[PDB]
Amino acid sequence: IIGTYRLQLNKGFTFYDTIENLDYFKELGVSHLYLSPILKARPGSTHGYDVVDHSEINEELGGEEGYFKLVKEAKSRGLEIIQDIVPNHMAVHHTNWRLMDLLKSWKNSKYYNYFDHYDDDKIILPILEDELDTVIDKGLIKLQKDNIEYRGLVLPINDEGVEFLKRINCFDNSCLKKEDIKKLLLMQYYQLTYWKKGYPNYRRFFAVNDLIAVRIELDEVFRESHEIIAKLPVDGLRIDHIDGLYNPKEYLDKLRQLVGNDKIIYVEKILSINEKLRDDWKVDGTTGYDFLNYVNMLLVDGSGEEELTKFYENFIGRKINIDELIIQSKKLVANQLFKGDIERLSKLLNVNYDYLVDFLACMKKYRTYLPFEDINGIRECDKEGKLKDEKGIMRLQQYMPAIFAKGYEDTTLFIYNRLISLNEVGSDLRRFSLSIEDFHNFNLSRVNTISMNTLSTHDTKFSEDVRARISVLSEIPKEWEERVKYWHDLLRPNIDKNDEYRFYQTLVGSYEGFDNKERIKNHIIKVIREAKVHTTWENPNLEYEKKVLGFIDEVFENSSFRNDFDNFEKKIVYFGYMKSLVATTLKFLSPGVPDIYQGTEVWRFLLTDPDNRMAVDFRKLRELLNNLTEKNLELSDPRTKMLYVKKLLQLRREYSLNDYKPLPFGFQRGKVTVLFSPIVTREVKEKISIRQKSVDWIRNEEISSGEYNLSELIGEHKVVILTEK
């Protein structure tokens, strides 16, 4: 109802670690703690999306005891929970006893249909670090009476294998041959392979072999997998990857039936160019990528579009067309990561493999929702009317988001580097910037929504503050161009200029001094592997990657670069905070519910997961909150941003806001007016009329009715908030 605060739970931050910080959250002003998944995940999981037991609350977080202790402790200071749940899939680990049961007994297992496996004879688990023969030859498979172990993974032995071991009267590695181990493995209901020379014959999360989907569309599977979930004393739920479901609508109807229509439910689901959530999803919105990108585009200055475009082209010496890039990247991922699944979907749907890859690469939204959506939702890419089997399309719909996500989010976003502050999850790189009236129209359609407004998550490519700095370049492209050409002649890098160009922008976004350089180094390596041009996760080009790492060591080692960059960067950083405050105000005061990624209630520069997964120093945040004040804060002081978070969450509790009236450079909701300027490096020339005695809500300094320059109202921060009386 007022604000959500996302916490990344794990062993290093447990239910008890949360309990210690409840007074902080309360005083910050937030109403809901937005908890990461809490069912038992693999031991040591830093994130909890690799579920291994549906019927138990993760002991590494505090177990069932800690959770209810947390909840009751939290409610006792007006804090509610929105609990992240993961319906679609589980992890291949021995701690997943349901899955082990299927591996042991196959058709005799009650969990035979709980898992989305393709074939009825075997399951192929491409999880070996080497060829099976090599693994065996190295003796990396340890035998017991009734189980094998590989790299700490325990898998059971079926009846036939155990009969074999009794025949040869041998139950450890000492009393049998390598070809005996071989024979034993070949007769297991599971067949282990090298992770690169095997297609899984089961449905995954995207292309993650470790994760196998559960068949929640079957009513027994849904009941069992939501047994603990249904008992949770929580105000709300967030649904991970709902687009993976065979029938999301049916799933939401059963979830609503289960936990009642009063709970707040958000879905993780990426919306495209004009899409909205299905009317019949009894759901209160998404986690807010739509909002994020609307603000994100608004922060970008349109007048720099042509110049940034032409320089990018000139600097890499290659023109890049975005629509072809998107298309080729989806086709790249279809063939590289999902060839096995698309081969099967071709046979199921009676089409040629290429036509089907062409169709998936054509889809302009993440997926269609037959049998509820009409068949003409696939009409436009199925130009030849080949796709007709309803259930086949229903089946295909489960893979459609994986092509969009892996092709656009995890490939295109790491290649088209014109201005990477835009390369975000849920973005549309076909557009560049957005207007205030565009922003108003977006809000107008959401005036009564409680959907999340967020600018940073555990999956966003960057934190909001990283994007705010890089977007400043759009306002000063000429100066930007000068710097890059000098840096490029100064350093003489033996690498792809697209990688080099990428790096510079990343430094601009994330600069906190020329130390701690392993973060940017690891990130850039991740970037170019995602890009899939000179290297990949499956086949790292160690020779190229070393050139890239060499370049970055040279950079941090070049006094001329450091001094030049440092001086350019002072401007960026100064203007970036401004954009960040504008965005921040927009997040708390637009229609919808504002979300806070842990630690980002102050300045915080996070790159891509896993960099955005670093520990948050709550002790420090508490000390800042303790010493909070409204004068004379340096813009770059962390208390400046925290001040906004605390005062706008507070605003949310005292002033009614259900109302939205657009202004040329702001908007009104009740007795609240927001005035801002997304452009920050140039003085805004506008007259503004304050009709009535108002209060600067951050400064608590009354402003009297009258005409004003806008530049005087918004001052250094580029945003003001006015309340009446």
Ligand SMILES: [Mg+2]
């Ligand atoms: Mg995710």
